[PDB]
Design a protein around this nucleic acid. Structure first.
Ligand SMILES: *OCCCCCCNc1c(NCCOCCO[C@H]2O[C@H](CO)[C@@H](O)[C@H](O)[C@@H]2O)c(=O)c1=O
Ligand SMILES: *OCCCCCCNc1c(NCCOCCO[C@H]2O[C@H](CO)[C@@H](O)[C@H](O)[C@@H]2O)c(=O)c1=O
Ligand SMILES: *OCCCCCCNc1c(NCCOCCO[C@H]2O[C@H](CO)[C@@H](O)[C@H](O)[C@@H]2O)c(=O)c1=O
Ligand SMILES: *OCCCCCCNc1c(NCCOCCO[C@H]2O[C@H](CO)[C@@H](O)[C@H](O)[C@@H]2O)c(=O)c1=O
Ligand SMILES: [Ca+2]
Ligand SMILES: [Ca+2]
Ligand SMILES: [Ca+2]
Ligand SMILES: [Ca+2]
Ligand SMILES: [Mn+2]
Ligand SMILES: [Mn+2]
Ligand SMILES: [Mn+2]
Ligand SMILES: [Mn+2]
Lengths: 232, 233, 233, 232
DNA sequence: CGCG
DNA sequence: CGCG
DNA sequence: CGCG
DNA sequence: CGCG
């Protein structure tokens, strides 16, 4: 399979596969069964912000998700990603729907990698164009609509569709850990708009790191958030 | 053909095809016959530095090349790159040898692109090069890992630079260099190099280039063509 | 006197002292009588954006001012700032009112300086302004904390802009803008603003300026003097 | 007194005041008695590198000190700096000598602060000039010698002097924590050269954060590393 | 750039 | 939100 | 920029 | 590296 390290924004509780009984941010290592979660006060129709953090010193992958004039949700997890991910990886955003639906609109996406042995990579998207050549769009992902990236399908009228799954990956491979490295670090930021006219919103957005050749697994709509082929 | 916009560091004056009678920095638009050149006091065996700058406001592609405790060579040229290059491009370094030889060692390479239309941005910095660099497309004789440097032309096991060589490094991701509905667009590019030649005739040179995404080394672009051009038109 | 190099956004044509017959962006070297101006379609009540750029290679101080879904105004001027400004300077925003009035609200302000001689660098970005901003020297009527914005000229409790007002924000740290033994020197400056006037005569304007470290608002630099100049020479 | 948060590079063991029996990196909160230390293989005469890290999510101040072709030393400590430092602070380098001497040469100094409520500050020094107007030099600190910052005094010949103390602070105050802030972070980097012809080298270099008006305390040469007035 |  |  |  |  693909090797997956993700930060999940789960909006629908799949209690069948260990999700808590409420919308959660979670830190996912190689399994949709998060290794740590937190209660997340999802605001239907409000534009939200996600900062994900890791360095080689603290070896702690942390994330904050937050809305204007509101409290935040934090989740952290201690993991050596040098023992999990290959040296070279791709970084990406994923999203899915199932029986229930939501828009998976990405307005902004920023990512920075540093290796003091210094080597560096930084990209920032605030507008998305119709032909975004430095993005690998997989599944139902689309660019150009209001200058935003729409990871799952949404009607001309605006109505989000169900049983949808799509991903954006940055075109260039990233060196996220080096053999002879003193410090390695990455920051990742994105703003999003999950809006659902149906009061049961599903299924969620995730930042992920994966092997370079990563592709949407067979039937990864819904509970699998476009990352995992099974709920193991 | 490929569309090429390059900054050439010509160490070998090919007077035959319009090169001045001396080693020159030049600004090359779609032709190896530079549209602007300047005298460059190339120092055999010394590590040197190249800054290249362009913006949508000044629409002026400029370059400075320099060695520690020595004077600089500057070249500028007014060109709307929105009228020359496609929207999406790759940025790269090229180098060649021919009748003579030189090492075309790159120790560092930095590039930044900005589009305010609310800014979109790409920045990469290489100070070490690994044996398996997946964020680089090596074409021709180009190789990485030797002293953690990028060697664009071939170097014998013995350490001596080889002749009739040509190789290019391109950054893996395509870059958006201009958009119609953008207010300001800009790029900076920096690289350090080591041109060293045991032969007192050093040839042929190093160049920063921007090109169509799918760009590839032209056949027989060894020598005066610097791995960019198929002909000296 | 203070030495001033400024980019003026003149909303009130003072034809008396060489302002063109319309609202203009201008490049001001040591005189309010700009050494280059351009027609600026100022939009009352709309948030606008200003990019200002200069390098040691092109020695050309350039500026773009623009509002969303509208054309830009550009101005450039060739000047060696190494021949004008001292080595160390402060960078600042200024604004004034006089016969009429306007709000001189600054929502954002970004500035970057680089000296490669191995690069020395300074960058600050303000998107919020707090009530107690210790990294800013407010002079005159300038104030912070109102909506998290910087209000260079006075605004009544009622919300209406006041006349015969002048205030300036300077970044606390001195900046090294040029060195003798430097190969490349550069600065970028960005700020968003809101000029809104209930009076259909809006006055007087906003300006980015560089100046000697100890620079201070000249006496009676309200109005056509934009808080930079003591006289209209 | 001044309010002090420092990362100490202690080269001489003052066992009198809790220093371990060997050269250590340590994380100092309001006392020269570090709240955590680590063994540091100081290389006399070799140029070394120091990365210091903190964010509001992990609330963990961490540091790595290292030399080329050698293993590193790490020290971390969990502390809310919003409960320790005032909102506005100055960031600085300090160094001292006592009975025993060393050079306290700084070749490089970089510092970055971020507040997503984004506000930002970044300065990088690779050369130091004779009149460095954006630095507040206190005590014996000097700039211009080889383009380096010399925090303690060193003879024309090169010989480092004893009972010396000097500090560099960046001119501008820094906002290191905001009331209504989602994320706050700072990185700090500096290269240094501690060289001692006397085989007993003392006393050390520190990165510090302090109240804006901070000044070298009375008799803070030696064990006090130019930060503390007493060894409490 | 140096030699014929 | 439906099915045991 | 609009009014005398 | 000196002093109990
Ligand atoms: O109208 C809103 C009603 C609230 C919904 C019920 C929430 N409670 C709940 C469920 N739901 C059952 C799980 O399976 C439902 C069908 O599964 C499909 O739909 C979702 C939506 O995208 C997807 O995650 C699945 O993979 C699949 O596509 C619990 O388990 C629980 O608690
Ligand atoms: O101060 C300026 C130095 C003057 C150099 C004079 C040139 N020396 C020289 C020539 N002249 C003719 C050049 O073409 C012959 C060489 O051809 C091959 O060698 C070079 C080496 O890269 C290459 O540019 C060509 O394209 C070709 O591969 C000599 O014959 C000689 O020696
Ligand atoms: O499309 C361009 C608009 C044309 C504007 C015409 C000017 N309107 C105007 C004048 N003309 C003389 C200007 O000086 C008198 C005003 O003096 C005070 O007001 C301004 C406001 O900031 C200031 O610049 C001056 O320095 C002084 O404080 C009027 O009298 C009038 O109305
Ligand atoms: O020639 C090298 C010999 C090694 C030195 C001894 C190390 N062992 C040791 C000490 N030393 C006694 C502490 O006080 C000594 C005098 O103190 C003065 O000198 C130092 C040097 O800068 C300074 O830290 C003091 O504040 C004061 O200025 C231990 O305690 C221990 O273990
Ligand atoms: Ca779920
Ligand atoms: Ca040539
Ligand atoms: Ca005016
Ligand atoms: Ca000590
Ligand atoms: Mn989940
Ligand atoms: Mn040429
Ligand atoms: Mn004017
Ligand atoms: Mn200690």
């Amino acid at each position: 399979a693909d090797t997956i390290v993700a930060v999940e924004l789960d909006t629908y509780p799949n209690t069948d596969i260990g999700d808590p009984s409420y919308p959660h941010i979670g830190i996912d290592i190689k399994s949709v069964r998060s290794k740590k979660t937190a209660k997340w006060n999802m605001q239907n129709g409000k534009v939200g912000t996600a900062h994900i953090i890791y360095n080689s010193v603290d070896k702690r992958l942390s994330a904050v998700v937050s809305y204007p004039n509101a409290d935040s949700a934090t989740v952290s997890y201690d993991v050596d990603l040098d023992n999990v991910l290959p040296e070279w990886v791709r970084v990406g955003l994923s999203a899915s729907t199932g029986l229930y639906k939501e828009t998976n609109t990405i307005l902004s996406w920023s990512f920075t990698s540093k290796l003091k042995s210094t080597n560096a990579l930084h990209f920032m998207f605030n507008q998305f164009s119709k032909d975004q050549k430095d993005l690998i769009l997989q599944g139902d992902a689309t660019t150009g609509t209001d200058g935003n990236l729409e990871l799952t399908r949404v009607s001309s009228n605006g109505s989000p569709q169900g049983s949808s799954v799509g991903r954006a990956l940055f075109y260039a491979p990233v060196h996220i850990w080096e053999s002879s490295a003193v410090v390695a670090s990455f920051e990742a930021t994105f703003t999003f708009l999950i809006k659902s006219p149906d009061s049961h919103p599903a299924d969620g957005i995730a930042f992920f790191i994966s092997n370079i050749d990563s592709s949407i697994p067979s039937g990864s709509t819904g509970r699998l958030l476009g990352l995992f082929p099974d709920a193991n």
